[PDB]
Symmetry: C2
Subunit: 513 residues, 2 copies
């Protein structure tokens, strides 16, 4: 973990304030020691333009995509940023107004889907793509930050969109999930082959998950992956297709206007056989929650361990993320969040071998968990979680692990961004076996998602650092900095200060050079 800080000075407002791009990189001023083995680029995406002239964007996810880069070489750091030349951005700059409808901001005058790639960036073959959650992803140059092209996934595969959280196997194979308007489809993009053709042209749907409601598919943000299984969590946050596919020009609608909460379904969990490409018909059921981020998933004897960042309730958490709410003063921010769903890290355990003879009993026979799974007579398997972390309006969010070596596998550690009534104000580490936590936090300092980078000679799982971008608007300080923490105990190793503001960023990666 929890925060030990209040924010009466309101400095978190700087996260949602427009900035200018740069012509070329700035030097970041180092204190402490940047590790000499740290060579490459921290790439991250966020909104950077929160109004076009006098027309405001209303939601956290509406501001125009800004691509950020911190470069590390021989103990020195540079910072650079460029707006992504999406259709949304280019047309806004041409017409000097909001032209494309964003997540929570209707544009005044069917109509074009946004390609505002403000959320994440990921590798496909030798390319990098910035994304949001629509059918449009934007190819970008990781060295110059130039925009290369728009890619419409609809030209290649049968999905209406895909999440900003594809899984990436160590050979470069990419898996993602997307709505299909009815199913949820797993897309597979293979590694780059000898022929050097673009791997997106070899995309395919490999398996399909069914929908609980013919006309109302669930919002999906992420999914789990193990060597043998795919895990999909179907939440009660629904997309109303009667509103989504109606004409938005007539009604004046945006994406937020299409969400509704199903009160009675709870959460349905789904698994598929990855290698045999087959949906498994196990009716896993539990209580209602929102889910954005899976932490990690793995196999342990005949069971799937599913670690999740949950929000307890069926109301859509995105309702609390209009910019007007996030720009309020601190007492009002806390008050507004009182009735929101509560964040909680939970471990669910999914049995793979269901024996009818155990009807009415707990199938989770593993020795090291308090998670349960009850086989009912109607063949639903009712799940209860083991709670790994819980604090009052203190979210362990934007989870990251040592992904390259422990993604999809037995693991011990997760790193997170700590939210305090939705305001990011600390960095966290969680031992998922012991429930021990570590916190890093300074007054009036607003961090981003921490990204893990392994030491080249790592023996343990947490032999490395985490990198986070911190906004520090206190007038006795430079506006922002890159923070490097030792992954062992979250003690500070270095920081690299820059003389300009940085707004909120969501996700990213470290690209080794």
């Amino acid at each position: 973990m929890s925060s030990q800080v209040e924010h009466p000075a309101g400095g978190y407002k700087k996260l949602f304030e427009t900035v200018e791009e740069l012509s070329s990189p700035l030097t970041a001023h180092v204190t402490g020691r940047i590790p000499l083995w740290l060579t490459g680029s921290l790439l991250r995406c966020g909104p950077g333009l929160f109004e076009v002239g006098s027309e405001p964007f209303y939601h956290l996810f509406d501001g125009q995509a800004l691509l950020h880069k911190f470069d590390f070489k021989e103990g020195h750091v540079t910072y650079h940023r460029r707006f992504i030349r999406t259709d949304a951005y280019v047309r806004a700059m041409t017409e000097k107004r909001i032209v494309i409808t964003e997540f929570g901001t209707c544009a005044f005058p069917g109509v074009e889907v946004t390609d505002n790639a403000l959320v994440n960036i990921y590798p496909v073959g030798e390319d990098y793509y910035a994304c949001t959650e629509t059918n449009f992803i934007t190819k970008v140059n990781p060295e110059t930050l130039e925009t290369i092209k728009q890619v419409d996934l609809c030209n290649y595969v049968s999905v209406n969109g895909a999440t900003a959280h594809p899984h990436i196997e160590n050979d470069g194979t990419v898996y993602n999930i997307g709505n299909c308007f009815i199913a949820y489809n797993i897309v597979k993009i293979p590694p780059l082959q000898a022929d050097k053709e673009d791997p997106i042209s070899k995309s395919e749907i490999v398996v399909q998950f069914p929908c609980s409601d013919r006309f109302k598919p669930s919002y999906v943000h992420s999914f789990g992956l193990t060597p043998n299984y795919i895990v999909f969590v179907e939440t009660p946050v629904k997309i109303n297709l009667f509103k989504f596919l109606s004409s938005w020009s007539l009604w004046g609608a945006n994406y937020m206007d299409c969400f509704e909460s199903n009160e009675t379904m709870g959460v349905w969990l789904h698994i598929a056989d990855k290698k045999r490409k087959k949906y498994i018909n196990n009716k896993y059921r539990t209580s209602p929650f929102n889910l954005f981020h899976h932490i990690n998933t793995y196999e342990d004897h005949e069971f799937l361990i599913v670690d999740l960042c949950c929000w307890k309730g069926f109301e859509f958490v995105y309702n609390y993320l209009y910019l007007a709410n996030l720009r309020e003063n601190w007492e009002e921010v806390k008050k507004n969040a009182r009735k929101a769903p509560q964040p909680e890290v939970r471990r669910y355990v999914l049995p793979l071998n269901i024996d009818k003879a155990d009807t009415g009993k707990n199938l989770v026979t593993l020795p090291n968990t308090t998670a349960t799974a009850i086989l009912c007579s109607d063949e639903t398997i009712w799940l209860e979680p083991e709670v790994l972390f819980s604090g009052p309006r203190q979210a362990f969010e934007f989870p990251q692990i040592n992904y390259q070596k422990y993604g999809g596998k037995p693991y011990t550690y997760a790193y997170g961004l700590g939210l305090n009534h939705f305001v990011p104000d600390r960095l966290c580490k969680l031992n998922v076996k012991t429930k021990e936590t570590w916190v890093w936090q300074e007054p009036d300092s607003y961090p981003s998602e921490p990204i893990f980078v392994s030491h080249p000679d790592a023996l343990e799982e947490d032999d490395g650092v985490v990198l986070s971008v911190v906004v520090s608007p206190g007038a006795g300080q430079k506006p922002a900095y890159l923070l490097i923490l030792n992954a062992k105990d979250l003690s500070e190793v270095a920081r690299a200060e820059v003389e300009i503001n940085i707004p909120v960023t969501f996700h990213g990666l470290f690209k080794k050079s």
Copy 2:
């Protein structure tokens, strides 16, 4: 909290072995220093006779009630025990066989009065109880049995729990099934006329049943200055089996239980002072519940701290003596598919505004518990988990009851169960989730009972007392353990030269 010990020697079997009563008290041999302010009697109940001749009792809750007493005076300790002369026991001794049907043992009809579970004060009297209509008046100084009391002669219930709440003026509240509702009984304090307060018993409020024909098993309930809290679980009593003739079919109490798979848990509150059921449909996931820890009011909310078991299967299925007497690897294996124990805090909003439909009503600043108002007006609850360990139950909870019962509090003491075997003592800070453990190898404790220093201003300024069975051959068979309530460090122990079997509940009676 969790245990750090395995039990391959099987010493826990001594908890379920018959013992002989005593003719008069033994001296318990003290090591360390019994506090000189500790003056009175630890009274506790458990089974003590696990077979009548060659006829065995089958279930944990079948053996014949044994009343135990440790006396504390000027740093000296005595131990004494007597079988309760119930109808079940007396008739068994007369007829040299099992005459009355017990919880899980059919006799080859009359309701059992085997008062093996607890003891509590009414007026100037003490009553040993089980969970039926029969409670047994007993003498707290001599351990003699005085009389049988049939609650049905006084109030409209079929039984009452072994966990009545006791207000500081001596008023007693309890809950019992009525065969259809759950009735709260109130027994007033002793008046000037000196008449027996049981004759002034009354039903003050009634909770509805979720199923006309299948009432829930009820073990305990919550009480605050202003409210009564009742948790209706999916463990049901099948009245078609309960009220059928058991002589023909050969049935016991265990044979009447079934689990409702779809209802989950329904939580109920009543206005205590206005004697009125409140129509708030609190709903959550399925669990068994035996013991409320404590209940209190905080702004417009009820804080409900519970020892839960995650699942709808009846936990009592895992407590046949044959299972509990298995070797350690088999005990662990048998418990793998049982419900998981978990301490949970639920938060019940009292002011429900329809304008908040679809939102979380729990606006308190210090909890992660939630309560969602649905369109059908059910309020769906999620807990804050306070303690969770794999088959490691924080159970038999106790608090500083006299000063913090029904009120804001910080500390609970518990007996730690390891795949159902009691092997440690625990303390839980319910605000910080910090835990403390006391544990020795091959040592099987009982429920810890808290005794305040008489002049304490703080909540945990006192000791806990537990009766520990220690069958290791380098030790006396049992002892009374005294721990400092601050940190569970040992203050003293009082060893006795005879075995003591399992005990369930009890009290400390100040003299």
